[PDB]
Structure 1
């Protein structure tokens, strides 16, 4: 099995790379997160905004899997399903994936008043909380009316002391009953034991691509906690909860933008709020669309990249959004941190007082849409070579625009 993983704080370009290579795989598997993910595939001037739908959906011969560590907003997933023809037999949703309830998004908003993490306010965290509580509802529950009713009733009981605090409606109970009345018939044909499916595919030597969401530095354990998502985002998470074991992992493709972003609060050593960063904001704070909040912008951070590569075991890198840097006078790369006079070469567990140490590179003018290594400007290849060498992982994919085919393979 191969893994595509974001090695920054999300928005690296994972959906484009998965869609570009999905043709070579039998399965494409979203293994964690929910519809907090939000990215575009672009091909021939048509943009597809996916949230939980795996990025193999444009290849009807692929089987797309939503795995067990995902949290599922059923209504939103049904809305994605309606945009494609004949998804039956090529989309499967784990019967062990957990179900996001409307209360989860309301709890998310309420806790954000004091915590100010900058979540997507979609109830991701509170759904994972109920999973840990082992009170959460799972997709398999929807296949049996009696089971779902019993679990909903337990939810209504447990939720009573919170109706005021979380501003739950007077008709919360009645409305949620009708919610599942509407959406359970729509989603139930897609619910499957995807763990058995992938165990068998791996045993048979079928080709499996694992599609990460968010990014390594958003990992609940190893990211910039508390400014993280509530799931594990690295390659090992792909084979925690799919049914695949760590021995099954072959290629690990680390997706990184040629610069850095994060959306939401939290530390960001290479953030650039000076006029040197203004080009990044013009061309790259609005990560296309599908993403509403503007991204904080900064430079590539090799300290953080090397940390993420070690966590994932990246065997190759994809360098993305080179076109965003077209026309910039100069590009900086954070090669180390300065903390109270000490030079740090290694990503620390606390980024307090970590000041970026930069090397500056010449910019370039016209990478956009280039499809051949030969046609790139020297300054582009010099940048690529520096990153590879410093990080010790070969850049095997270069993206020069959102379009599927604007991708160079090495």
Structure 2
């Protein structure tokens, strides 16, 4: 199995890369996160913004799997399903995936008033909380009405003291029963034991592609806590809960932009808050695929990149959005941190007082839409060479526009 992982703070271009390479796989698997994710595919002038639907959906011969460590908003997934034809037998949702309830999004919004993490307000964190509490509802529960009713009854009891605090509707209980009466029949045909499916697929030598969501620096354990998502986002997360094991991982494709973004609060050493950062936002159209929030923009940070590469075991890199830098006279790359007169070459566990140390590169003019290495300007290829040398991983895919085919393969 191969894994596509974002090695920054999300939105690196994972949807584009997965869609570009998915034709050569039998399964494409979303393995963590929820509909906080937003993965944009563009082909022939048509854009799809996927949230939980895996990015193999444009190849009908692929089997798309939503695996057990995902958190599922059933209504939102059904709305994604309605955008494609004949998804029966090419989309499967794990019976072990946990279910996001409206309470979760209301609780997310409420706690955000005081925590100020900048979550997507989709209820992801609270759903993972109920999973750890072992009180959460799983997709398999939707297959039996009596089991679902017992679990919903426990949920109604458990949340009663928070009805006013969380601004829960006075018809919350009747509305939620009606929610499942509406959406359970639509989603139930897709619910399967996907763990067994992937155990068997691995044993049979089928080609499996695992699609990460978020990025390494948003990992609950190893990212910029508490400014992180509530799931593990590294490549090993793809073999924790899918039915695969670490020995099955072959290629690990780390996705990185030629600059940096994050959306929401938290440390960002190479952030550019000057009008150049605003230029990156405008030219790169850096607005959240899910929330439409303006992203924070900055320069590529190789200290953080080396850390993420180590945690993932990247065997190749995909370098994205080189075209956004067209016309910028000087490109900065953070190669180290200064901290109180100390030069840090290694990503620390606390980013307080870490100031970027920049190396500057000569810019280029017209990488947009280029499809051959021969046609890239010398200064682009010099930038690429530097990144490869510093990180120690070959850049094998280069993206020069949102379009699927505007990609160089090496």
Q: How far apart in 2 are the matches of 1:291 and 1:316? A: 30
Q: Compute the displacement of 1:288 (Å).
A: 7.9
What do the CA deviations read for 1:1-32 (whole angstroms, capped 9, x no partner)? 00000000000000000000000000000000
What do the CA deviations read for 1:66-94 (whole angstroms, capped 9, x no partner)? 00000000000000000000000000000
Q: Compute the displacement of 1:363 (Å).
A: 1.2
* Number of residues of Structure 1 aligned to a counterpart in Structure 2: 410
Q: Compute the displacement of 1:287 (Å).
A: 4.1
3-state DSSP class of the match of 1:42? strand
Q: How far apart in 2 are the matches of 1:287 and 1:323? A: 17
Preserved CA contact (<8 Å) 1:40 1:48:
yes
Specify the alignment match of 1:386 in structure 2: 386
Q: Compute the displacement of 1:178 (Å).
A: 0.1
Residues 277 and 319 (structure 1 numbering): CA distance in 2 closer, same or farther, change over 3 Å? same
3-state DSSP class of the match of 1:69? coil
3-state DSSP class of the match of 2:360? strand
Q: Compute the displacement of 1:280 (Å).
A: 1.0
Q: Compute the displacement of 1:139 (Å).
A: 0.2
Q: How far apart in 1 are the matches of 2:179 and 2:328? A: 50
What do the CA deviations read for 1:237-291 (whole angstroms, capped 9, x no partner)? 0000001000000000000000000000000000011233332122125348555
Preserved CA contact (<8 Å) 2:37 2:290:
no
Preserved CA contact (<8 Å) 1:40 1:290:
no
Q: How far apart in 2 are the matches of 1:288 and 1:351? A: 24
Moved over 3 A (4+): 287-291
Q: How far apart in 2 are the matches of 1:383 and 1:377? A: 10
Q: Which moved more, 1:45-54 or 1:281-290?
A: 281-290
Structure 1, unaligned runs of 5 or more: none
Q: How far apart in 2 are the matches of 1:22 and 1:239? A: 19
Structure 2, unaligned runs of 5 or more: none
Preserved CA contact (<8 Å) 1:285 1:296:
no
3-state DSSP class of the match of 1:353? coil
Q: How far apart in 2 are the matches of 1:287 and 1:112? A: 20
3-state DSSP class of the match of 1:32? coil
